Motif scaffolding. Sequence first.
Motif, PDB file in Angstrom:
ATOM      1  N   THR A   1      39.220  32.680 -22.218  1.00 20.33           N
ATOM      2  CA  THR A   1      37.923  33.045 -22.850  1.00 20.33           C
ATOM      3  C   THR A   1      37.747  32.229 -24.133  1.00 20.33           C
ATOM      4  O   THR A   1      38.763  31.999 -24.833  1.00 20.33           O
ATOM      5  N   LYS A   2      36.508  31.842 -24.434  1.00 18.39           N
ATOM      6  CA  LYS A   2      36.148  30.960 -25.575  1.00 18.39           C
ATOM      7  C   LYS A   2      36.736  31.520 -26.877  1.00 18.39           C
ATOM      8  O   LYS A   2      37.243  30.713 -27.672  1.00 18.39           O
ATOM      9  N   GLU A   3      36.666  32.841 -27.083  1.00 21.07           N
ATOM     10  CA  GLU A   3      37.210  33.531 -28.288  1.00 21.07           C
ATOM     11  C   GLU A   3      38.720  33.282 -28.399  1.00 21.07           C
ATOM     12  O   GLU A   3      39.187  33.102 -29.539  1.00 21.07           O
ATOM     13  N   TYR A   4      39.445  33.283 -27.267  1.00 17.61           N
ATOM     14  CA  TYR A   4      40.919  33.086 -27.215  1.00 17.61           C
ATOM     15  C   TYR A   4      41.244  31.648 -27.622  1.00 17.61           C
ATOM     16  O   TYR A   4      42.092  31.466 -28.519  1.00 17.61           O
ATOM     17  N   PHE A   5      40.596  30.673 -26.981  1.00 15.09           N
ATOM     18  CA  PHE A   5      40.716  29.225 -27.297  1.00 15.09           C
ATOM     19  C   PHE A   5      40.453  28.979 -28.792  1.00 15.09           C
ATOM     20  O   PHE A   5      41.248  28.247 -29.418  1.00 15.09           O
ATOM     21  N   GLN A   6      39.392  29.578 -29.348  1.00 19.51           N
ATOM     22  CA  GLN A   6      39.016  29.461 -30.785  1.00 19.51           C
ATOM     23  C   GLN A   6      40.188  29.967 -31.636  1.00 19.51           C
ATOM     24  O   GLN A   6      40.569  29.272 -32.590  1.00 19.51           O
ATOM     25  N   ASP A   7      40.746  31.125 -31.277  1.00 21.36           N
ATOM     26  CA  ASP A   7      41.909  31.759 -31.956  1.00 21.36           C
ATOM     27  C   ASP A   7      43.103  30.795 -31.955  1.00 21.36           C
ATOM     28  O   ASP A   7      43.839  30.779 -32.966  1.00 21.36           O
ATOM     29  N   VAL A   8      43.294  30.032 -30.870  1.00 27.04           N
ATOM     30  CA  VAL A   8      44.411  29.047 -30.735  1.00 27.04           C
ATOM     31  C   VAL A   8      44.120  27.861 -31.656  1.00 27.04           C
ATOM     32  O   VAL A   8      45.036  27.467 -32.404  1.00 27.04           O
TER      33      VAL A   8
END
Lengths: 768, 94
Positions: free
Chosen positions: A740-747
Motif C-alpha cells: 500500500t502507498k502509505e506503507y511504501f511512504q513509511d519505508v
Amino acid sequence: DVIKGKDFEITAKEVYDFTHAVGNNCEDFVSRPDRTMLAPMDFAIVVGWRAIIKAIFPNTVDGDLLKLVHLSNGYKMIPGAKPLQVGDVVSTTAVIESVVNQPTGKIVDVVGTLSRNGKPVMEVTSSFFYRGNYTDFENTFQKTVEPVYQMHIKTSKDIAVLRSKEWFQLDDEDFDLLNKTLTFETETEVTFKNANIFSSVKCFGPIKVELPTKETVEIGIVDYEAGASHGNPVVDFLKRNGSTLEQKVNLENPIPIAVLDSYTPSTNEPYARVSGDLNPIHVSRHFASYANLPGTITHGMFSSASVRALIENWAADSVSSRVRGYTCQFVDMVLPNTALKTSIQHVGMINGRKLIKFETRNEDDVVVLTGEAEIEQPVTTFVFTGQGSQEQGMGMDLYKTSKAAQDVWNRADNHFKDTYGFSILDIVINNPVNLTIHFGGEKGKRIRENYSAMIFETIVDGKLKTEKIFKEINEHSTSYTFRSEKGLLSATQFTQPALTLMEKAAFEDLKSKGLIPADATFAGHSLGEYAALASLADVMSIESLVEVVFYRGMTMQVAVPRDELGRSNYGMIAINPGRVAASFSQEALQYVVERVGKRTGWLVEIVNYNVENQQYVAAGDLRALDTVTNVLNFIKLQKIDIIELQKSLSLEEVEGHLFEIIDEASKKSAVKPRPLKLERGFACIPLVGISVPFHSTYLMNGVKPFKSFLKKNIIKENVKVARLAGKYIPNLTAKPFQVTKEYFQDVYDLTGSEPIKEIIDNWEKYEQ
Amino acid sequence: MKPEVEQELAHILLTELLAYQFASPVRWIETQDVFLKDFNTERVVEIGPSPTLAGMAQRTLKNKYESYDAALSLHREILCYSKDAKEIYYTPDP
C-alpha cells in the motif's frame, strides 16, 4: 435436485435455549456487553434440519422411517469463515451426496451447506440408514465432490504418463507441463447396475496450473465418461501420483487429554423443542415400542452436541471459533439417565490444526459415540532470535534425528562446499581455529571467482570507495585462510549462517510435524528476519538464504577500519534506563544520547529498542559509549531527573546543564588510548565480542552492494504476497508488511531509496 | 492492482526492507506491541538456541499488558523451541 430450506434468523433466545438444552456452558454463547454473542456450530443442525431430513422423504428413496438409523453427523467450517453470530440471517441448501443399496439396507448421505451474506459458512454432512432389502438400483447414485488433488510435474516421464490418459484434455495440446503444479478440482457422478459394479462413471472438472504469482488459472479439463466399470481411474490415478494440499501427520504416541463424564437428560423434551427433531421415538414409549427400541432413546444429535461441548472445553481451551471440524459416528442407542465416559485423545496434526479422536462409552463399557474433531491452535506468532549464543554443536542433536533438519543442513553444506569451498556443518560441529580454502582445479577456480566477486562500499575521507572483501584473493591466489582466536564459529560470517540454518531447520522440523498454523504472524530480531522469511514465506531457497547471510556477516566484518590485531574503535552497550533511575524514561535516554552525539561529535545511536524502559542497545564510537556510560553512572549518583527539570523547573536549561556533564565525561574518555575497554557501568553492560556498530546510519554506505547481492538471490517469482501481507513484521518499519502507498511512504521516510521514491510518484500507473 | 504487478511491488519493497534492515535501528518494542496488542497473540513461539525474545516478551507483558490481558481475559503462552520443545511438539512423558 438441490433442496432449498428457509432463511433462519439466529436470535439470542434460540442460542440460550439450545445451549441450556445440550449443557454447553462456553462463555462465547452467553450475552456480555461490548462483544457479539456467537452460536455454537452444533446449532447448524437446528438451521439445516428442515432441509437435511427432507432428503430422505422422496418416493424414489422409499423406506420405513420408523426403522431409520442416523449413522453419522459431521460439521466442517469453511476455511476463513468466522463462526455464526446472533443477528446473522443463514440460508441452508442440501443435496443427496449418495444413495446406495448395501446388502443390509439403503445408506443416504446428505450435504447441507449453511450460507450467510451469499458466502457459504459451513457444510453439515449426515449419513442416514434405512434398514431392509432394497434392489431399486435405478434410483441409487453417488454425486461426489472430490478433494482437490495436486501434482508437481518434475520429469518428462510424468508428462508422458499424463498425455497417455485420454481424460486429461488440455485446451492447448502444446502447453509446457514441466516444473508446473497442476491442481484437479473434480466431481465424480456414479450410477449403479448392481451393488458391486457402476453402470455409468463420470469424473469431470477443471485442471488448473499455478502461475508464478500463486494465482491458479484453468488450462484444461478432466472429461472421463465410462459405462459398466468397477471403479473411477481418474481419482485412483490422482491418489497414487498426487497429494491433497493437506497431509494428516500422526504424533508418535496419542496424548490422552481427559476422560470426562456426561449424563443424558431424564427426558428428551428439551432437545426436541429447540432442535425441531420431534421424532416420536425420543418422547413416546408407544412409538419406541413399535420401532423395537429399548426405550425412549436419547437423540443422537444431543449426545453429539454434549460431547462437542467437552471437546470445545478441553481441546479448544473454551474458545468456540477454534473448532473447525467435528464428526461423530453414532454406534449404539443411549437411554435417558445414562452416565457416559468420553476418552478424548490428541492423535495428530493437519497443517497446524489438532486432530482429536474421542470415544464415548456407557456404564457397561460399550462404545456408543466415536468421532474426530479438528481444532485451530491458538493465534500464534513466531519470533526468530538474532545473534547471541553460538555454542559449538548447535542444531546437531536435531540434525541427528529429523529428516527435514537433515535436508536443510545437507542442502546448505553442499552449496557452501560447491560455492565457497567449506562445510558449514564442519564449522558448527568441530569449531576449528583456522580454515584454509584451496582454489585448485576447475571447482577451485569457480570458488575463487565467488570470493573475488564479493565487494563492499565505505567512506574514505568523505568519498564512496568500492574496495573488495578479501583484498588478498586475486587471480593468482591458490588458497585463502580464515583466522580466529578460540574458534571460527565465533566469527560473524560463520555465526550468521549457522544460526540462520539452526532456526530454519528447527522450523522445517515443526512444519514436517504439522505444527505450523497457516495464518500465523512472524517477526525476527535482526538476523532472525532472514531465518523467519525463508521459514514462513519461502522467499529464498536454503542456498540463497545461506549466501545472503554469509555475505551479510562478511559486510559486517569489514564495514569498519581495524588495527593489526583486528580490534576497532566501535562497540555496543546494553542500557537499562530503569536501573539508573525509576523516573529515567526512554525519551530521556534518547535525549541524553542525541545530546552526547551532537556535542562530542562522535557516533552514538540507539540500535535496539528491546523492552520499554528496561532493555536498549546503543552502538557507536567506542569513546562515545564511554561518555554515555560515565553520564548515566553520574546521573544515578546525583539523583537528578531531566524529564522533571526540562518541564516544571526551566526551559532549554537541561540542554546547557547536561552539556557540562558531557564535557566532564568526554575529556576523561578521550585521554585513555584508542583501543579503550568498556567498563561495566551501573546502567551500561558492554556487549562482548561486537566491534561493528550495525543498525546505525554508519552502515548506510554499505547498503548498495548488499542490496545488489540480495536482488540476485531474491527472485520476484518466489515472493508470494499472500504469505507476507499482514503476517511479516519488519524490523525497519515495525508494521505488518502491506503493499500500500502509505506503507511504501513509511519505508521511504526511514531510508530514502530511489526505487521506493519512483513507486510513490508512479503509484496510480501500477494500480492500472 | 493485478496479481503480477502486486508481486513485483512486494519483491521491490521486501529487498529494500532487508537491504536497509542493518542500516536502521531494530524497533522490537513497536514490533512486540504489534503482535501482542494489534493481533492478540495467545502463543509467542521463539525459534532460536536461547530464550532471549521469550525473555523480552515476558518482561513486556508484565510491564504494560497486565490490565489489557485481564480486560480481554486471554491466556498468553510464551514458548521457546530450546527449553519448551515438549509444549510445541506435543511430546509429553508417560
